[PDB]
Every structure is written in structure tokens, then in C-alpha cells.
Design a protein around this ligand. Structure first.
Ligand SMILES: [Mg+2]
Ligand SMILES: [Mg+2]
Ligand SMILES: [Mg+2]
Ligand SMILES: [Mg+2]
Lengths: 215, 215, 227, 219
């Protein structure tokens, strides 16, 4: 447990090079975000393929063992959801017997994290999932409380990871992608509560930003 | 608006005749649910079929106006999740333009509802979502809390509604199926956080029952 | 001489399919039906999601029986399309998640082709050099077996090449008058003798793209027969 | 007869495909590769996902330009299966959710075998809107020869859809009307592209490696 937020021996996320993108012209963008998204960074399909592997990583990892996954509610809604879909199916086609469910959901809200009694995790596998840890002070503060109950393990799954130079530098043990620190909307990422329903993790327009700033 | 929980406009739910099931055995049931299930009320594929249908109906009812769907947390993941998927997709292939997102998502846990600072829905169109609605000591209570902010619309969308001998029991506006008063697990349907990940909705067993505690 | 391929279209040792009781039907108004079919579809036999859930299981069975060895599946063109498609998708996916070792792919696809009011039931299955099925496990996928003529005929034709085992998978079997008929090895539903359409079932090239297996209505028969 | 029928193979007034710069690949590693393909796939060109996403946009495109008018889609055997099938799936759906009624199915499928195309009577097509489907137009023969045949029956139009399009030197060829990607001249396999009937079932479009090549025929 001392290793947390460090990614001790993770498999490195897929590297997405600086200034690399796709034209939205090339996809079916829904009319409403239509005029706001100029560049796609992660296509919805790429995300799903990558996430499929992630699940597999995780499945082979806690196989034959109770896994307690936690959704930091709001933003983790897409990934976590993809994730649970894949584990479920994976274990179903597995053919390796296991008399336990692929995982156990749990929900929490936020900035500090807000949860019920954590006594439930004493001596258990704890997988906390997020869309991204842009700070991890909140992850560190919650991780603290998590420690006290003596859970069996505690890891972090994160969709994205920004190579920045401004933070508290916490890292997941299961990362989908490693990206240019740029602004991203879509795929549950949002501006001002906007773009969550777009399928592609897009780069935020100077235009999206205006309209979605004020008038 | 005075019609909440009343089911006034409502198109009638897919009606499932009494004592009608399918054997689990001719389905692919993940090893950790094998000893447990025997009869299947609803194949997840039948339920994705119905829900696609409700999505449409809903899409048809709020086209071009903002929609705020509140997900009563924990028990409504399945349904809620399957719903925005469609909602959004339908919006995309409609080619009939709208400057508005398919929906705005919101989460409320908690047998009272553990709120949020719901003033925001001051004239919005709100659809509350539930997996099933057996009673009303909450659905009716939160409905009143809402009512006070003069939201522009109030409707409930429920996956299931058991045919019952009760009264003043809420009715949905967008209802999935009408099933008899039976004990069902799976497809998010619970039993001590049990059978959630199972695809379909199963009638449970004394068996499934027995095993599930500390005895 | 090649070894003789034992039972074939017997149905020897198979697992019986989902049994669908007579007069069991869902109502079209309860699902989303597209406009081109709307006016003609009232009763639904098998809701397309139901048949996915069902073929998921068939594929599981198919996997367990040929896993680890080459499996060559033949798609009888036009009809067997949807069913076949659903099947290789599951097939390869299961293969992919099994985390259970194999140096051979899920399958190798193959395609072939082929009475009514005045003619003859001599739909003769046509294909290339069959010689490629020698010592191979072959699986013939049909959307339904209705005369067994064409499959008995092809059957003979394939037995001459000495394939290693030769089975048949069909989406539905109709409960109807007969004996002296081919029975599939892997089959999804047992249904009563009613005229179906949709989900790749057709009425004079119609309905294939409808997503559920429905019953043919008098209006469909009318609107779409020979004028 | 506006927006002709003599432009076939020209790809005139098309919408240029998605452009995939040279030397752009993903690591196989970052994907879940099936055991049987594991040692042969080192690099990925087009992740099966990116493919569905492109095809979704092709499906819409094809929809808009044929709405309410019968479309006949000819799939070219073995090779164009995956792509063909992603197409008609999206087509069916997009029409199901359109709210713009057509009184006609979203398509009529037909299949052809193979290099000459192996058709049956093409009479079925007189007056028809015909869309032809390929994983790729390798060279011009097959199509041109076939287009000649088709044109003999006078379709209402004949267009080509192709998934991939290669940047090549030999250009005196067919250009597609609806094409997925523009790629580098590299040897690919997966997502219905095979190497001697190998890797059709793989999910992604991979580059043909030497091991797999060295291993799948001439030893
Ligand atoms: Mg977060
Ligand atoms: Mg609930
Ligand atoms: Mg047939
Ligand atoms: Mg081809």
C-alpha cells in the first residue's frame, strides 16, 4: 500500500505524440457540437479499443478475486462504464471458472471525495477509477482515508494522463493514454457541463470557449 | 404538472403475461450465476430492444428543448446507461438539426432521496429515471421537492412496473414492461448488491436466496 | 477411400434449442419499426435482441467443440447472411477473451449460393473446388433447413472429399409434419410452422433488413407478391 | 441525366478520404491481440475502432445521397465483407432513427465472386442506383471490365465505395466515390485484409510483417 499514486510497475499508457490529431470533418459530428469542435484527439473507437485492452490488463490482474471498483462520480461516468462492460464480458467468455462476480460497483461524489462508510474495504481490492487526475490532492486525501481501513490493495485506473509540469504528479497503475497537455472536451470530459455526450475526446475550440464562457 | 406519477399521456408498457419465463440454460450464464438462476423473465436483448423503443418515444417527446434526466443512483445504472446511449445516437442520425444536446445528466442517490442543490431545474424539462417503482415514499417526496422550483416538466421513466394490489403507487410516463409481482434479479436488479452484472433479468431462487447472507 | 462421415443431418447428440411455444408472439407496436415495414408488420416471432442472446450461446457451444483446431464455416449466400455474421463475430470474440491458448484462428469463411407456385425445389448449392475441405472440420450454416434436398445433395458432394467432420448449424427449426429430414447440430429456436420474414428472412427479397423475425401478414403477402 | 454515369471510376466531386500521413502507426502492444496473431503483428495502421468511426461517416454520406431512392449494393466476395457489413448495419440504423420516412428499404444487397467479377444476369439493375463495394481497388481491370458490363444494362448510376485508398505510382486507375482512408503504399492485413487467407478475423488493419510473411506460404 505505500505505493499509491506512483504507478510502481504499470505497463506504460499508449503514447500519443504532440500535435497529433484528426479532422472532425472526417467524422459524423452531431449538429450541436458541430460548430465547436475543430480537432479530434482521441476518436471514440480508439478509446474503446484501448479500453478493451485495459480491462484485460485488470481482468488478468484480479482474476479469481473480489474487486471493488469505485466511480468518482460525475466525470468517471464514461470510462468506468466502458470498463465494467468489458470485464463482465471478458469474464463471461473466459471459460476459466471463478465463483465470484467480475467486480463490485460503488459510487462517490466530490474538492474532496465524499463517500459512505469505508469500512467495507478492509482487506479488499480497491480500484478507484477516474477520467483523469489533474491534481490528485483529492485522490491523495481520499486515498488517506482508504488506507486506515486496511484494504488488500489500492490501485488507480485512469483514462488519460497529461504530460504536464504543473501538479502533484500522481499516476495511475492502469492508463489508457498519455497526452499533450491540451484542453479536452467530449467523452464525458466537459467545458461548462458541455460536450459530455459527444463520442470523441476532442480538443476545445477558442469558439467553444467563448460561447461557453459568457453573454 | 399536476400529472406527475400519474401516467396520464403514457403509452402502455410492453405487457408480459403471468408465469412466462425462459430457461437460463439455454442462455450463456456466467459461471458465478449458474448455480443460482433457472428462469429468465427478460433477455437483456429483449430489454435493449424495448429501451431503444422508449428512447425513441422520449426523443420524440423532447426534441429541440433542453432535457435534464436525473438518475436515482445505484439501482438505475443499467437503464439510465442504455437510455442516453440511444438518446444520443438517435440525435446523431436524425439529420434533423437541433442546437441542443440530447440530454443533460444528473445523479441523486438514496427510503428518501439524498438530494443535490436542485434549484437549477427552475423551468427545465425533467425526466426522473428508475429501474422499477414498487412504492412511492420517495418518488412522491422528491417530486414535491422538485415541484417547488417550478420546473417546466415532470415525467418518470421506469424499466419495470409489477402488476399490483397496492394503491397511490406511482405510474411511469415511459415504462419498459409490465410484469407480475415477482422477485427479479439481474440487469442491475439487486439482491444484496447481487446479480447486478448478470445480463438478463432473472426470477430468483430460494437457492439464490439462501446462499446470499451469513446464513 | 476416405473415412465415412457418420451421422449427418441426423442431429446426433445435439443440445435441443430454445423451444418457442405455439402462438407465442410479441406485438410490433411495442418495438421501433422502420417506415418501410410499418404497414406490414404486426406480430413479432423473435425479437432481434433475443436471437443475439441466443446466438451468443450457440457460438459458445461451437467454440467449445472446435476450439484449438481449424474450423471452416460455409455461409450459404443470401439467406444465411445475418446468422453467419453474428456467429463469426461472437466466435472470434470469445476466442479473443478466452485467454486460453491457440495458434489457429476462430474460423475460415467460405461462401456458396442457391420451389414456389409452378416450379421446383432444386435449389442446387453452387461452389468452387471443394477439394479444399479435405480433412477439415466443416460447419454449414443455414438460416433454416426446409427440404434437406440441397444439403443432402451438397452433403454427398462434400463427403467425397473426406472432410474431417461435417456438421450443420441453423437459426430455426420449424415444428411441422415430416420425418426423413435433416436436423441441424447447432440450432437456436424451435418454432411452430408459420411463414417468417425479417432479420435476413425474406419475402421475395423483402424484409431481410428488418431486425426481428416476424410473421408474414396478409397485407405483406398482398403488397409484395408477383405484381 | 445530371451528375453522370460516364464519370464511373473517376471519383468526381467526391469528398476526399481521411488522410493518414506516412509512417504513422500504433503499437500492437497497446492492443489486445488474439493469441494466434500475437507473434505476427508488431504494428497497427488502423485500429478497428477508428474503422467503425470512419464507416459511420461513410454510411451517413451514402444515406444522404440516396435517400428515398432504391440503392442496390454489390458486395465483392471474401474481400469486401467486413466493410460491406459495417455499411449495411449503419445504413439500416441511420434510417431507422431518421424520422424522415422513406417508403423503401435502406438497400438491397447482392453478392459477386471473383481476376474477373462473377456476376449472374445483370438485368436486375436496369434503371437502378448501383453502389459497388471494395476493401480496395487494387488495380483497374476487375472494376473497369465489370463497369463495362454493368453500363450495358443502363443503371441509373454506378458508384464505387472503397475502404482504403493507396498512394501509388501506377496511377491510371479507378478512384472511388466513397472511400474510407488514404494510405501509404504498405502491405496491410486484418479487418478482412488477408495474407494468403491469413488474418481476416483480426480486428485491426495491421502492416504485414516479415515473420508472418516469411511464414505463411513459400517456406
Ligand atoms: Mg475526476
Ligand atoms: Mg432503484
Ligand atoms: Mg434456406
Ligand atoms: Mg476486393
Amino acid at each position: 500500500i505505500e505505493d499509491y499514486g506512483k504507478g510502481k510497475g504499470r505497463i506504460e499508457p499508449m503514447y500519443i505524440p504532440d500535435n497529433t490529431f484528426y479532422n472532425a470533418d472526417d467524422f459524423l459530428v452531431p449538429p450541436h457540437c458541430k460548430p465547436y469542435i475543430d480537432k479530434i484527439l482521441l476518436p471514440g473507437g480508439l478509446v474503446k479499443d484501448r479500453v478493451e485492452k485495459l480491462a484485460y490488463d485488470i481482468h488478468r490482474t484480479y482474476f479469481g478475486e473480489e474487486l471493488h471498483i469505485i466511480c468518482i462520480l460525475k466525470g468517471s461516468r464514461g470510462f468506468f462504464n466502458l470498463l465494467i462492460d468489458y470485464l463482465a464480458t471478458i469474464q463471461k467468455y473466459s471459460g476459466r471458472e471463478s465463483s465470484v462476480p467480475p467486480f463490485f460497483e460503488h459510487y462517490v461524489r466530490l474538492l474532496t471525495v465524499l463517500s459512505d462508510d469505508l469500512s467495507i474495504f478492509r482487506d479488499k481490492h480497491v480500484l478507484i477509477v477516474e477520467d483523469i487526475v489533474d491534481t490528485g490532492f483529492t485522490l491523495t486525501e481520499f486515498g488517506e482515508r482508504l488506507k486506515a481501513v486496511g484494504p488488500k490493495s489500492m490501485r488507480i485506473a485512469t483514462l488519460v494522463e497529461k504530460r504536464t509540469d504543473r501538479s502533484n504528479s500522481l499516476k495511475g497503475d492502469f492508463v489508457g493514454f498519455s497526452i499533450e497537455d491540451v484542453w479536452i472536451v467530449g467523452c464525458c470530459y466537459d467545458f461548462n457541463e458541455m460536450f459530455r455526450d459527444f463520442d470523441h475526446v476532442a480538443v476545445l475550440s477558442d469558439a467553444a470557449r467563448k460561447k461557453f464562457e459568457k453573454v
